[PDB]
């Protein structure tokens, strides 16, 4: 149908490569709200366009807010593809018809706990800032642990009050004794907290740090206080370009419209003009799959099978992509965990013992891993053999 594809980019994406189907291709640089409103109202007089695909190069998240608001006030579905417009927001509204791409906090938390399980790091804590949305993360973690095969060891949750005075906050920071630590904070507070912990000496090789995609901001902007080996997961898949994203969006829209045509023919409806609804795609594209890729959504608008990527900080001060996400499982390019002993130039880590043994009947009993839970029984120990 009549679909408009608008891209706000600084990266040079040209336009020529971009029963009744018509497509609109444009390139935009500015991102001020008046420009958005003016362009939307101008194109809304352009031959009754029902489809809107948008992406952004900037990293401002209010663009998605305004897009959702205008979609609600015009009853026209809008997509998020890139940048701040594709950032997953808190709670959409049934009045709105705006939809995004990428995963929420809960899916990424599940992926993080899967990663932790696959390395048998069963002792951890919980560090949370005053950043909004922390209590939902706490509740999801509490619900996830109690119905798991692992039986995780969780230390008491660390909650910050303000910009840490290092008077009573350090009291809680000292009690952190685990090797795995979970942190949920914004990028500005992360530098402060990490410098604080490095001064406290909790920046050892065994003191791993895990953070969601929120704290990992610009790929170019990399603070020096992040130790080489920070654990981060963000949906920024650099193997798939925005062209594939907008093509998949077009496929989603075409499939949804085609399938909604047969139940009711007169579905596609856009408002006449800015100045001066019964059957839609609002509750219809829950189930959808194009070319095998299950591009279905949730009841709150999220994706069903997103593309998450596990990234870490190499010694070259770069976010190094390591692990991707399969349909439901987790793949790891590096099965053996690298030590990353050199987070900075002041870290002479060298405490380990390479132990080699031989299969002896009463002393060294070699047994296969339990297939029921894919974990060695607690009275055994990990091992490997180059077979």
């Amino acid at each position, epitope marked *: 149908l*009549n679909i408009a594809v608008l891209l706000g980019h600084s990266h040079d994406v040209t336009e020529r490569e971009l*029963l*009744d189907v*018509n497509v609109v291709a444009l390139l935009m640089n500015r991102t001020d709200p008046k420009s958005l409103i003016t362009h939307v109202c101008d194109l809304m007089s352009g*031959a009754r366009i029902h489809g809107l695909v948008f992406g952004d190069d900037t990293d401002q998240e209010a663009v998605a807010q305004m897009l959702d608001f205008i979609s609600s006030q015009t009853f026209i579905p809008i997509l998020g593809i890139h940048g701040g417009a594709s950032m997953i927001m808190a709670d959409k509204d049934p009045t709105s018809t705006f939809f995004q791409f990428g995963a929420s906090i809960q899916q990424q938390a599940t992926v993080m706990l899967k990663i932790m399980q696959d390395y048998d790091w069963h002792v951890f804590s919980l560090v949370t800032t005053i950043f909004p949305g922390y209590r939902d993360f706490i509740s999801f973690i509490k619900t996830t642990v109690d119905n798991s095969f692992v039986g995780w060891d969780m230390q008491n949750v660390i909650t910050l009050d303000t910009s840490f005075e290092d008077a009573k906050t350090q009291v809680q920071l000292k009690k952190i004794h685990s090797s795995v630590i979970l942190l949920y904070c914004s990028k500005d507070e992360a530098v402060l907290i990490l410098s604080e912990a490095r001064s406290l000496g909790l920046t050892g090789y065994d003191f791993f740090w895990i953070v969601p995609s929120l704290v990992s901001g610009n790929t170019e902007l990399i603070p020096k206080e992040f130790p080489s080996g920070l654990i981060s997961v963000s949906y920024d898949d650099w193997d798939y370009s925005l062209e594939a994203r907008v093509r998949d969006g077009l496929g989603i829209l075409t499939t949804a419209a085609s399938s909604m045509l047969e139940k*009711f*023919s*007169y579905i596609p*409806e856009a408002k*006449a003009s800015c100045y001066g609804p*019964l059957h839609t795609l609002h509750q219809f594209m829950v189930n959808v799959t194009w070319d095998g890729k299950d591009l279905s959504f949730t009841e709150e608008g999220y994706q069903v099978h997103p593309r998450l990527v596990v990234i870490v900080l190499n010694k070259d001060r770069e976010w190094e992509k390591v692990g991707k996400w399969e349909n439901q499982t987790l793949s790891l390019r590096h099965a053996v965990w690298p030590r990353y002993k050199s987070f900075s130039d002041c870290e002479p880590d060298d405490n380990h013992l390479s132990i080699v043994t031989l299969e002896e009947a009463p002393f060294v009993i070699v047994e296969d891993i339990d297939p029921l839970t894919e974990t060695c029984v607690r009275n055994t120990v990990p091992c490997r053999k180059f077979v």
Partner: nanobody
Amino acid sequence: VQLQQSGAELASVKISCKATGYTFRSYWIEWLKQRPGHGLEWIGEILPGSGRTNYNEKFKGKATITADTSSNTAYMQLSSDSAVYYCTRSRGTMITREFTYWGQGALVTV
């Protein structure tokens, strides 16, 4: 696809436009005035599938367009002007928004 309309008239009136060549719930229907001495005008459009209606500012408040999904007929009511009338339908390929199928024409006079 062929179109048929009502007869001549001679207060208020109503003119029917019946479709017997396609699925009547898919395409818009537009009304035209062709009073002699000039080319033509444009009144409004109606979609039988959902009932969304748009009207021209010049003819706003004087012409009311309605449709019946059962008999596949189009009704346009002028209240309280002697011109030839036409009801038409686009080809459907869209964008061009041209007029291809034409009616017979109802001659109203006061």
